Design an enzyme around this catalytic site. Structure first.
Site, PDB file in Angstrom:
ATOM      1  CG  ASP C 349      31.275  56.475  38.167  1.00 51.29           C
ATOM      2  OD1 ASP C 349      31.472  56.476  39.462  1.00 51.29           O
ATOM      3  OD2 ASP C 349      31.186  55.375  37.591  1.00 51.29           O
ATOM      4  CE  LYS C 460      44.842  34.321  44.629  1.00 46.45           C
ATOM      5  NZ  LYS C 460      45.148  34.213  43.175  1.00 46.45           N
ATOM      6  CG  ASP C 690      28.512  52.958  35.841  1.00 49.46           C
ATOM      7  OD1 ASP C 690      29.204  53.817  36.427  1.00 49.46           O
ATOM      8  OD2 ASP C 690      28.697  51.730  35.967  1.00 49.46           O
ATOM      9  CG  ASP C 694      27.595  57.558  39.143  1.00 49.23           C
ATOM     10  OD1 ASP C 694      28.444  58.206  39.788  1.00 49.23           O
ATOM     11  OD2 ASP C 694      27.880  56.544  38.472  1.00 49.23           O
TER      12      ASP C 694
END
Ligand SMILES: *[C@@H]1O[C@H](CO)[C@@H](O[C@@H]2O[C@H](CO)[C@@H](O)[C@H](O)[C@H]2NC(C)=O)[C@H](O)[C@H]1NC(C)=O
Ligand SMILES: *[C@@H]1O[C@H](CO)[C@@H](O[C@@H]2O[C@H](CO)[C@@H](O)[C@H](O)[C@H]2NC(C)=O)[C@H](O)[C@H]1NC(C)=O
Ligand SMILES: CC(C)CCC[C@@H](C)[C@H]1CC[C@H]2[C@@H]3CC=C4C[C@@H](O)CC[C@]4(C)[C@H]3CC[C@]12C
Ligand SMILES: CC(C)CCC[C@@H](C)[C@H]1CC[C@H]2[C@@H]3CC=C4C[C@@H](O)CC[C@]4(C)[C@H]3CC[C@]12C
Ligand SMILES: CC(C)CCC[C@@H](C)[C@H]1CC[C@H]2[C@@H]3CC=C4C[C@@H](O)CC[C@]4(C)[C@H]3CC[C@]12C
Ligand SMILES: C[C@]12CC[C@H](O)C[C@H]1CC[C@@H]1[C@@H]2CC[C@]2(C)[C@@H](c3ccc(=O)oc3)CC[C@]12O
Ligand SMILES: *[C@@H]1O[C@H](CO)[C@@H](O)[C@H](O)[C@H]1NC(C)=O
Ligand SMILES: [Mg+2]
Ligand SMILES: [Mg+2]
Ligand code: NA
Lengths: 291, 32, 996
Positions: C349, C460, C690, C694
């Site tokens: 991941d 911005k 995590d 997953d």
């Protein structure tokens, strides 16, 4: 996945033909070498032992005390009438005493007439092979009175009041030593304490000792034991056709139709006992003459 | 007599050997 | 009918978010500014269930204790115990004074299984116990607007269709449908893997509910801003709820070590029943009856069952798992300690696993030069040059013009792991200034802020003016930051080494290429500028109220760009390199954007530098991507949008022809599809993650790895291994230990399997040659469960013979734990020599006591008889029953001692599979103690007072201890020349036939 038997690319039972031959040849050479090695070491082992004496003799320190009717449970149960009931006993007694007949002990070159009276031990030199084949003292069946007879091929033994002879375990170089004249309460026995190994039978408890009425012992010259003139033993190689001493025991006054226990204990200094082996030194039997 | 073997001496030696070998192995696994 | 329930959960979610505010309020029946009446809320609360996932399926402790009492190995020992009681039952009713041996053995096997169960259960229970100490579930109350009033209630008391307000910092309770936002940015990292905080707007943006901004999600945290929304999904019906429910209801599979043990038992019982049946027929062919032949069959089959190999293998796995727990790499399943070594394709991941899941200042721009800052999690890298004036100006522009400050308890915590209040970008800037530029507290209060201008919705920009504390100039210091395209339009001066220069295109174009360099690198870049306000036109008393043009927008002094991105963890790149070195395919599987996934892949090692994707070649040749042949592209990026329209064959081809693959924008369900696609090839898969996304991937993978702190509870429970320290290098350590213990298990098995030939051969020839029993049962137990236990356990402590992280991953169809070579060695060559040595000691003892070996043939008939007390030996002596039985038992004792003597050499040769005993070395202290304890124990069992009574083991005459020495030396020399020919000749004979 379990049909790997064959294929068009050569495999049998899992592998090819040339691989089967390679493995088989390797295993044959390997196991052949293993066999040759084990045989060579076992040969060295054979070279470490002699032909006239076992290296270790401590595991037979107390000699045993066996009998002629090798019963399945040391029990003698039969019928005084039915001849087939006691056939298994008589068969073993005749086969045991088949080597003690006067015709069996006929060669004077291997047999020696010891004597009608038990004498001192007979030592025939050392145990080496420097001397020829030693002589074996004769032991005619006549010594066991009332349990030998002059019967035909079948020894007509005792139906009522049976006979049970006892035998001392043959041990190489063993010299039996009877108890000193200072006998520590050894159950009335004859005064021939110096040249015979005494053996006395009795019951086991207050009941068996009462049921067994009278016992009659028979031996060399009338002594209940083994004569010292037949010891020591010089092995089967140097003394083939050796006849160890025998001593018969007859139970005259028995309580028919009752199983009673008898303990025939051999006494002596060189005779040990064992609470685990009821045969070392002593000997047990369960007689029951059921009519 | 040849019918006797000093089994007590051999047994004692075997027990002493087992004791020494085990304490030595313990010293082996205790490298300090 | 649970199949359909799981199938409707493997599909990506649907929604009705694309609805006008009136259609939404009409479908749900809810006031957009007042919510609903509390009575309606309680009616739904008591209608469908509180807003909380259903608890996990509780696992009672007697269930997993019975589990440890069962299995594949313990089951073989169970069938062995059953066969023992069957044989004893036959021996009891059929013959006189039956022997207690078989019963003794059956109860011993049962005790072995029960004890192994108690130990393994205590270990797995200890792992789960320390796992429960990590559940720190703090109740979190949500802010709900009901009946027109704001109330803070428990998250479970929230229902469907009611107004809910969230503030920057608060956690999104349920799945919301945004209705009004005010610069609201949520954190979709734990759910969709989106790293940077995705903003949430009331207007529908994407057809995918995960990509659109009008939907807040369960378990997500509102980073900044405030927003409102109507609860669309509640409880288990939520997004992460369906993901967790899918994870719980998935199959675990069969670990590789378990399949190896099963194949091992297949060969063990195969040869066991082959020998038992062939000898059953042989015994019937000789003289024995069916009654006796049946007992022979059971004895031969049960005898070929390693009774102690169960405890030894369990302790082996336990020891390696102990080392795993020492390095904060806890394993929940015991056998899971081995799976890492057999892995050959790691699906990782990105957010939270490959990376730190935290915005960090990546690179800076100064003097037209790129300066890379240290982005390690523990600050163990190269520090840039911090002695120039450009840095002293840029650092003040960032430390001052930023709405980021530390909180109350942020004192003892490190500069990075501490919590910062505000935007993620401003947090990264504050941490970088607080780390490489002293402190920002006294640096911020040193320049008293007068008037500020926050970030704007369009163009911005963030600016602010401060007083100047320098002891040489009282001019006001104005600073401003913003996108580089917004600052380039408002700049004319450029700072360099302390002085200014015009906006010459010779260096301005260099600034543009630097911007595209840091931008193309997957990072987010910002521009910082400042200017000295003339104190003559704006004195110290003038107040620049934020209304009109009081500050010069243009003619500013640009100092430099500052990029930022979530950097990978410290040992992550090196770990990826080690995994690839061991031949493990690394495939990134993340739901983040592809522009960032490809950059992180190239930065960690998944995509090797130089390899090009199917798109990179088309970009280098200025041709359409549909022209380049995909075979010319080694690496490839697969978008989740395209993955939805894929078949099984297409995914198979993606994995077969591409070596470096990166799956981006993939849903958790697609992650599971990818893991299944990798498993279709037949390779061992390890999923490292995590987030909740997953969970379905870690569950279905051959082995799941969860992050111990940065991970979610669902994927942490659905995983098989936890990294309590989040050190991704533990994956490398795991793949090393998994191979190490694998080879050591091979050695240990060959050791226990070698002792079976001398354990059964006495009984075999006892049936054939009719000789007295050479080896007793109790002595066999003293070998399998007595002496040999310590050597076999010590065999686990053996180290690597060569580099294991160098060889390719073991082939599951080829490199099995117990191959046909181990059987040819243990059962075929070594055990055979041990059996011959035992028979030698046997014949020595009997020939020395008066029974010549040639005379021992056909002697057992009358030997075992309990009443024939006149058994003639070779010297004419008459032996009683107990006398010769004492010799047989004092003949079993040296056979057992002989076993220990040959096991010395067998252990030394099994310690090394290819290396030489002189090369490797007796450095295994546990093995040395194993030999010392083994010998001392064997001597104690023979010479302890009362052993010939209890265990029927009598003392040995000292010369017996030497009858076995030549066989041990032979075994050692034979195996030594074996490994020597394997070393010198690595081709095929000694290697493919004996090397196991
Ligand atoms: C052997 O058996 C015979 C019987 O055949 C016994 O002879 C009897 O002996 C008693 C004395 O005890 C005499 O009163 C009988 O008249 C004898 N009968 C016969 C037929 O001879 C003889 O005593 C037994 N021998 C021993 C040693 O007990
Ligand atoms: C042989 O044993 C019998 C017992 O079986 C003895 O005779 C018994 O003597 C008791 C008195 O003590 C009487 O009550 C029994 O009626 C007798 N029975 C018989 C059958 O006579 C006998 O004395 C014993 N004889 C010897 C020589 O020991
Ligand atoms: C191959 C070598 C290095 C192994 C060293 C251990 C050998 C030498 C040791 C291991 C066990 C030992 C035996 C242990 C038990 C007995 C009985 C004791 O009452 C006399 C010594 C004797 C007979 C020992 C002889 C030496 C022996 C065989
Ligand atoms: C009691 C006695 C007669 C049984 C004799 C059994 C012997 C002949 C058997 C027992 C184990 C057998 C071996 C088992 C293992 C191997 C390896 C295999 O890949 C080929 C067969 C081969 C090479 C066998 C050869 C024959 C063998 C040694
Ligand atoms: C090629 C060379 C090394 C092989 C030499 C073989 C040696 C190691 C073997 C051959 C025969 C063996 C001996 C055979 C006989 C005896 C007597 C016995 O009561 C104890 C074992 C003992 C003491 C053996 C010890 C080892 C021995 C001497
Ligand atoms: C009870 C026994 C019956 C056959 C013969 O009468 C000898 C008896 C004593 C020895 C006993 C056998 C039975 C099988 C064994 C347990 C069998 C065995 C041994 C070890 C083991 O793990 O599994 C089986 C082989 C011999 C055995 O130990
Ligand atoms: C034993 O003592 C008795 C008298 O108590 C005596 O008659 C006999 O001769 C002695 N025997 C020996 C061998 O001394
Ligand atoms: Mg075993
Ligand atoms: Mg994640
Ligand atoms: Na699993």
């Amino acid at each position: 996945k379990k049909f790997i038997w064959n294929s068009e690319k050569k495999e049998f039972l899992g592998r090819t033909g040339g691989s089967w031959f390679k493995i088989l040849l390797f295993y044959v050479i390997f196991y052949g070498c293993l066999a040759g090695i084990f045989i060579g070491t076992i040969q060295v082992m054979l070279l470490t032992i002699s032909e006239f004496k076992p290296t270790y003799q401590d595991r037979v320190a107390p000699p045993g005390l066996t009998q002629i009717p090798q019963s399945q449970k040391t029990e003698i149960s039969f019928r005084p009438n039915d001849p087939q009931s006691y056939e298994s006993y008589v068969v073993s007694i005749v086969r045991f005493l088949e080597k003690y007949k006067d015709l069996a002990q006929k060669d004077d070159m291997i047999f020696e007439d010891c004597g009608n009276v038990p004498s001192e031990l007979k030592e025939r030199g050392e145990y080496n092979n420097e001397r020829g084949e030693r002589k074996v003292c004769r032991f005619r069946l006549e010594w066991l009175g009332n349990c030998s007879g002059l019967n035909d091929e079948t020894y007509g033994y005792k139906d009522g009041k049976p006979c049970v002879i006892i035998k001392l375990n043959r041990v190489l170089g063993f010299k039996p030593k009877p108890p000193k004249n200072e006998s520590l309460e050894t159950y009335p026995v004859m005064k021939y304490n110096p040249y015979v190994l005494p053996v006395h039978c009795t019951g086991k408890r207050d009941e068996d000792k009462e049921k067994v009425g009278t016992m009659e012992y028979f031996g060399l010259g009338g002594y209940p034991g083994f004569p010292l003139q037949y010891y020591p033993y010089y092995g089967k190689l140097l003394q083939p056709k050796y006849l160890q001493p025998l001593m018969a025991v007859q139970f005259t006054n028995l309580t028919m139709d009752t199983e009673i226990r008898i303990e025939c204990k051999a006494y002596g200094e060189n005779i040990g006992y064992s609470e685990k082996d009821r045969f070392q030194g002593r000997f047990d039997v369960k007689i029951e003459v059921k009519s | 007599d040849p019918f006797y073997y000093d089994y007590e001496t051999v047994r004692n030696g075997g027990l002493i050997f087992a004791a020494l070998a085990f304490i030595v192995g313990l010293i082996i696994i205790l490298s300090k | 009918k649970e199949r359909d329930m799981d199938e409707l959960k493997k599909e990506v979610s649907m929604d009705d978010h694309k609805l006008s505010l009136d259609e939404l309020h009409r479908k749900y029946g809810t006031d957009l500014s007042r919510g609903l009446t509390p009575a309606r809320a309680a009616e739904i609360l008591a209608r469908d269930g509180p807003n909380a996932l259903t608890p996990p399926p509780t696992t009672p402790e007697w269930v997993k204790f019975c589990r440890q009492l069962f299995g594949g190995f313990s089951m073989l020992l169970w069938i062995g115990a059953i066969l023992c009681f069957l044989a004893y039952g036959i021996q009891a009713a059929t013959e006189e004074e039956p022997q207690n041996d078989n019963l003794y053995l059956g109860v011993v096997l049962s005790a072995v299984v029960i004890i192994t169960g108690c130990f393994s259960y205590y270990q797995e229970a200890k792992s789960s116990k320390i796992m429960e100490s990590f559940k720190n579930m703090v109740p979190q109350q949500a802010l709900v607007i009901r009946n027109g009033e704001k109330m803070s209630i428990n998250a479970e008391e929230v229902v469907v269709g009611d107004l809910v307000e969230v503030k920057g910092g608060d956690r999104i309770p349920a799945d919301l449908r945004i209705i009004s936002a005010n610069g609201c940015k949520v954190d979709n990292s734990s759910l969709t893997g989106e790293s940077e905080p995705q903003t949430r707007s009331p207007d529908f943006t994407n057809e995918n509910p995960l990509e659109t901004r009008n939907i807040a999600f369960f378990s997500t945290n509102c980073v900044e801003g405030t927003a409102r929304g109507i609860v669309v999904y509640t409880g288990d019906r939520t997004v992460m709820g369906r993901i967790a429910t899918l994870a719980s209801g998935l199959e675990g599979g069969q670990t590789p070590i378990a399949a190896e043990i099963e194949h091992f038992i297949h060969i063990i019982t195969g040869v066991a029943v082959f020998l038992g049946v062939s000898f059953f027929i042989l015994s019937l062919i000789l003289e024995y009856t069916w009654l006796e032949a049946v007992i022979f069959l059971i004895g031969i089959i049960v005898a070929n069952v390693p009774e102690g190999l169960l405890a030894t293998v369990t302790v082996c796995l336990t020891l390696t798992a102990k080392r795993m727990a020492r390095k904060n790499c806890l394993v929940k399943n015991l056998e899971a300690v081995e799976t890492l070594g057999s892995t050959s394709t790691i699906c990782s991941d990105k957010t939270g696993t490959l990376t730190q899941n935290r915005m960090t200042v990546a690179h800076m721009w100064s003097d037209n030069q790129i300066h890379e800052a240290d982005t390690t999690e523990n600050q163990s890298g190269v520090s840039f040059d911090k002695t120039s004036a450009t840095w002293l100006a840029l650092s003040r522009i960032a430390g001052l013009c930023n709405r980021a400050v530390f909180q109350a308890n942020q004192e003892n915590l490190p500069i990075l792991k501490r919590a910062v209040a505000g935007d993620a970008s401003e947090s990264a800037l504050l941490k970088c200034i607080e780390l490489c530029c002293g402190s920002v507290k006294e640096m911020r209060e040193r320049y008293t802020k007068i008037v500020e201008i926050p970030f704007n919705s369009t163009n911005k920009y963030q600016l602010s003016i401060h007083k100047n504390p320098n002891t040489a100039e009282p001019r006001h210091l104005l600073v401003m930051k913003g996108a580089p395209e917004r600052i380039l339009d408002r700049c004319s001066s450029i700072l360099i080494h302390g002085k200014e220069q015009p906006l010459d295109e010779e260096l301005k174009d260099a600034f543009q290429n630097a911007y595209l360099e840091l931008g193309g690198l997957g990072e987010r870049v910002l521009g910082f500028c400042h200017l000295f306000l003339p104190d003559e036109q704006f004195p110290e008393g003038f107040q620049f109220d934020t209304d009109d043009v009081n500050f010069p927008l243009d003619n500013l002094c640009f100092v430099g760009l500052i990029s930022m991105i979530d950097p990978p963890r410290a040992a992550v790149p090196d770990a990826v390199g080690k995994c690839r070195s061991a031949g493990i395919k690394v495939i990134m599987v993340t739901g983040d954007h592809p522009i960032t996934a490809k950059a992180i892949a190239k930065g960690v090692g998944i995509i090797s530098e130089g390899n090009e994707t199917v798109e990179d070649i088309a970009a280098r040749l200025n041709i359409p991507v549909s022209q380049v042949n995909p075979r010319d592209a080694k690496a490839c990026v697969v978008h989740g949008s395209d993955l939805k329209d894929m078949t099984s064959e297409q995914l198979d081809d993606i994995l077969k022809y591409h070596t470096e693959i990166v799956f981006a924008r993939t849903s958790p369900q697609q992650k599971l599809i990818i893991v299944e696609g990798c498993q279709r090839q037949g390779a061992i898969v390890a999923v490292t993650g995590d987030g909740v996304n997953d969970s379905p991937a870690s569950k279905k993978a051959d082995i799941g790895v969860a992050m111990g702190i940065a991970g979610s509870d669902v994927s942490k429970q659905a995983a098989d291994m936890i990294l309590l320290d989040d050190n991704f290098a533990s994956i490398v350590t795991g793949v090393e230990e998994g191979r190490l213990i694998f080879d050591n298990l091979k050695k240990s098995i060959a050791y226990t399997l070698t002792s079976n030939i001398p354990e059964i051969t006495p009984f075999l020839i006892f049936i054939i040659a009719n000789i007295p029993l050479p080896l007793g049962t109790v002595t066999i137990l003293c070998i399998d469960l007595g002496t040999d236990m310590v050597p076999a356990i010590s065999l686990a402590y053996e180290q690597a013979e060569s580099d294991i992280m160098k060889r390719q991953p073991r082939n599951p169809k080829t490199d099995k734990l117990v191959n046909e070579q181990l059987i040819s060695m243990a059962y075929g060559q070594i055990g055979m020599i041990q059996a011959l040595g035992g028979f030698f000691t046997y014949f020595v003892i009997l020939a020395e006591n008066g029974f010549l070996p040639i005379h021992l043939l056909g002697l057992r008939v009358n030997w075992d008889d309990r009443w024939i007390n006149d058994v003639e030996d070779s010297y004419g002596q008459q032996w009683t029953y107990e006398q010769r039985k004492i010799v047989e038992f004092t003949c079993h004792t040296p056979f057992f001692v002989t076993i220990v003597v040959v096991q010395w050499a067998d252990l030394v040769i099994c310690k090394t599979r290819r290396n030489s005993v002189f090369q490797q070395g007796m450095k295994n202290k546990i093995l040395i103690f194993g030999l010392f304890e083994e010998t001392a124990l064997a001597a104690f069992l023979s010479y302890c007072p009362g052993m010939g009574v209890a265990l029927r083991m009598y003392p040995l005459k000292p010369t017996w201890w030497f009858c076995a020495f030549p066989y041990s030396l032979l075994i050692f020399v034979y195996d030594e020349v074996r490994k020597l020919i394997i070393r010198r000749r690595p081709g095929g004979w000694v290697e493919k036939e004996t090397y196991y």
